[PDB]
Design a protein around this ligand. Structure first.
Ligand SMILES: C[C@H]1O[C@H](O[C@H]2[C@H](O)[C@@H](O)[C@@H](O[C@H]3[C@H](O)[C@@H](O)[C@@H](O)O[C@@H]3CO)O[C@@H]2CO)[C@H](O)[C@@H](O)[C@@H]1N[C@H]1C=C(CO)[C@@H](O)[C@H](O)[C@H]1O
Ligand SMILES: C[C@H]1O[C@H](O[C@H]2[C@H](O)[C@@H](O)[C@@H](O[C@H]3[C@H](O)[C@@H](O)[C@@H](O)O[C@@H]3CO)O[C@@H]2CO)[C@H](O)[C@@H](O)[C@@H]1N[C@H]1C=C(CO)[C@@H](O)[C@H](O)[C@H]1O
Ligand code: ANP
Ligand code: ANP
Ligand code: MN
Ligand code: MN
Ligand code: NA
Ligand code: NA
Lengths: 296, 293
């Protein structure tokens, strides 16, 4: 009856423009397809994905009194996602993304959408974790202040560092206080080294470094060699690779909370990620339980 | 009341400031504030003419959009008389990448058109009764309005923007306007395109802007194209979006005031230079005082 998985942060709005190619050669203007601001940033996708897979999720994030804020509220209402909007003077998180015909995405992340005085109230975290098994913390503020509290709780914690430097100190509090750490490998100087470093802090059981259509790589606590997983071919054209890594997290966690072995969890993630690559910005979509369990 | 009737061009730009154009491929950049704003070609011309002290009226189709909200708020805030016609296609919109030098890569939404849309003749006739001039933006249903305008006692201007000089859809605008403005960025043969507007159309003069290099003008009855020089902005160049529209505003302010061609060209250059100094975080147009000295 209560929250099974608490999702912290990551609520926002992407404005997608489909472009002929990336990098886009300079002109005064291109005529593009329909431009339509939608909710569905990393916190929105992890929530939707987990909920579509049948888990009782709660989603909490700071939210502006914005037209962007309206979109996020409507997103959760539309997909039946339990949601708590916290006030903030900074405004709702935004990005402008350029999507190529191959599904590749160039995100322009608004970095002004932070108020240092924002906090996820301790009582709210406590209320939604009273019977919960897992908390996913998005790397958006004020997520950096929540791990003193979560570390004392009988729940597992996961995070997604996305295109982490491997060096940028800001993501460390996330990377070093999470049992399951996810991240992309596109901005890593040394993938293997970053993965080993996250493990050498003595908290994470595994690290996953995703590599798009190549699948990705994983490192398990106490193991020396990194493992790979294969990407799954989508049953539809790759249109928009936005939310794939979030879909991967959702799929993986579904298997994690169901006691599945690592390889199955990785399989779930890959299938969910491939599905997400086939969804336009014109609709919101997350893979369903039945389809996730369909391949062998 | 009204001096100038502005038709079309009501829309919303979403600006993202980027380190360089063209933008090399990365998964993500961290950029400054992204804040959708009203102020496409029609909104800017209206505000420019209004700021300079002319009596304006702006008419365009508008969607029951969040974008529509921004547009309506814009006209109210700046006190621009405005009449929104309903449309099912939605409010026009673009995503613009703006570099540190003010250069802009616009991403125009070409889906915001409904073929059944029309400017109602009775609304057109009503606002052309006392108007001396009508400016028609090249957005639909603009292409259906020149039959009525042709029989009215008003001068007509238009702005063709980054026209091919070949795309047939703009020809109805280019060939039925007293004053034809356009950008020269996409022109293979600037001079030929200008003369073609003179010969096939009824333009009394044609202006092909060229950004910081000024632009080109061709006058009916003359053989050679003239040049005008750009004026340096008096504040840092931030966002060149709206420069061309400001040029039209400054030019018309003098044109409707019977000022010589050289004076009108100069006003536009100043107005356009000023336009490049306004952020996407503010709406701004040059006033009478700053323009006249
Ligand atoms: C979710 C988001 O995470 C990442 O964004 C982080 C930045 O990369 C960090 O640099 C940091 O931003 C700070 C600035 O660096 C700093 O100058 C200051 O302005 O404060 C900023 C915020 O504290 O932290 C950011 C997160 O808070 C990543 O780069 C970004 O791409 C990620 N968003 C993507 C996710 C999805 C779907 O998964 C899309 O909806 C978005 O469009 C993507 O941009
Ligand atoms: C005002 C706008 O004019 C120009 O846009 C025109 C396109 O260039 C044409 O191709 C045509 O678009 C049609 C498509 O070609 C067609 O495939 C179909 O999708 O229908 C479309 C609409 O009929 O007509 C367009 C005008 O509606 C120009 O390219 C564009 O850049 C101009 N907009 C700029 C104006 C300003 C200055 O303030 C900025 O606000 C905008 O961001 C600029 O993009
Ligand atoms: N083009 C593709 N074809 C097939 N599978 C894909 C493709 N792109 C991604 N995937 C799968 O989805 C996973 C996530 O992709 P990836 O691009 O690495 O995530 P991401 O960049 O973090 N997406 P996001 O949630 O928007 O930050 C990969 O590990 C693959 O399993
Ligand atoms: N950087 C600049 N410095 C000085 N004057 C400028 C600058 N950029 C533009 N101008 C002036 O503004 C005029 C119009 O600029 P231009 O870029 O040609 O119009 P535009 O691109 O169509 N703007 P827009 O309304 O967004 O379509 C030029 O002829 C100059 O007089
Ligand atoms: Mn990611
Ligand atoms: Mn223009
Ligand atoms: Na997608
Ligand atoms: Na500007």
């Amino acid at each position: 009856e209560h929250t099974d998985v608490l999702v912290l942060g990551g609520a926002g709005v992407d404005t997608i423009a489909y472009v002929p190619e990336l990098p886009l050669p300079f002109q005064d203007s291109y005529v593009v397809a329909a431009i339509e601001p939608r909710a569905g940033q990393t916190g929105d996708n992890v929530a939707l994905g987990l909920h579509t897979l049948g888990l009782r999720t709660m989603h909490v994030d700071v939210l502006g009194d914005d037209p962007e804020g309206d979109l996020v509220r409507a997103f959760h209402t539309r997909h039946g996602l339990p949601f708590a909007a916290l006030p903030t003077a900074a405004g709702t998180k935004r990005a402008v993304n350029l999507v190529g015909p191959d599904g590749r995405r160039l995100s322009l992340w608004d970095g002004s959408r932070e108020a240092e005085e924002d906090r996820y109230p301790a009582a709210l975290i406590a209320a939604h974790t009273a019977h919960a098994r897992h908390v996913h913390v998005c790397i958006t503020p004020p997520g950096q202040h929540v791990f003193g509290q979560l570390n004392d709780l009988p729940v597992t914690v996961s995070t997604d560092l996305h295109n982490w430097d491997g060096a940028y100190e800001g993501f460390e509090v996330y990377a070093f206080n999470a049992d399951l750490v996810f991240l992309s490998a596109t901005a890593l100087t040394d993938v293997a080294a970053t993965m080993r470093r996250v493990i050498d802090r003595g908290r994470a059981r595994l690290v996953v470094a995703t590599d798009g259509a190549h699948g990705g790589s994983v490192l398990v606590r106490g193991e020396t060699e990194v493992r790979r997983y294969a990407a799954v071919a989508p049953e539809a054209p790759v249109v928009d690779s936005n939310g794939a890594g979030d879909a991967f997290v959702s799929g993986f966690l579904f298997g994690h909370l169901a006691g599945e072995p690592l390889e199955t969890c990785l399989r779930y993630g890959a299938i969910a990620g491939a599905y997400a690559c086939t969804i336009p910005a014109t609709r919101a979509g997350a893979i369903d339980r039945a389809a996730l369990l369909r391949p062998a």
